[PDB]
Amino acid sequence: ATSATATFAKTSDWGTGFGGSWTVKNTGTTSLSSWTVEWDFPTGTKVTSAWDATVTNSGDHWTAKNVGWNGTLAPGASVSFGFNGSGPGSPSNCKLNGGSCDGTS
């Protein structure tokens, strides 16, 4: 609502592998620049490969960025990015844009 919102989704899991599908939507807020969605991966999990989004890691915390080098986007738009990780696929602590996430957590 009058801001940036995101939601978690499932792509496809093959036995032990799972396909993460995050949804990013920036509408309402002023002119944007880039979207950075990060979360905590307590349970045995790790993004082995990421597409359309550079997923990084740091100990027990993870983050996903795409325009972290240009940061040039409009105040209104919607984009999604998927990836493949080895584990359950049940991420938590959905915080993006410095602590922001609706319709999920």
Side-chain angles (χ1 to χ4, degrees):
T2 76
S3 90
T5 44
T7 323
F8 172 74
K10 254 295 294 306
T11 325
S12 145
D13 62 305
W14 48 100
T16 183
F18 81 90
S21 249
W22 294 98
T23 313
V24 188
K25 176 138 95 149
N26 324 118
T27 56
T29 28
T30 69
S31 39
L32 244 86
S33 265
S34 34
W35 46 275
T36 332
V37 56
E38 45 276 317
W39 1 253
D40 180 56
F41 263 127
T43 42
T45 312
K46 55 239 291 249
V47 178
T48 299
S49 270
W51 50 80
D52 210 280
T54 299
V55 184
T56 188
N57 84 289
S58 170
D60 290 55
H61 172 101
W62 285 73
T63 305
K65 62 273 251 65
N66 188 38
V67 211
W69 35 268
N70 250 32
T72 168
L73 204 136
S78 60
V79 187
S80 142
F81 74 91
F83 74 88
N84 160 34
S86 205
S90 287
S92 65
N93 214 355
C94 312
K95 57 241 270 257
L96 79 114
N97 193 41
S100 329
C101 221
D102 212 52
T104 15
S105 35

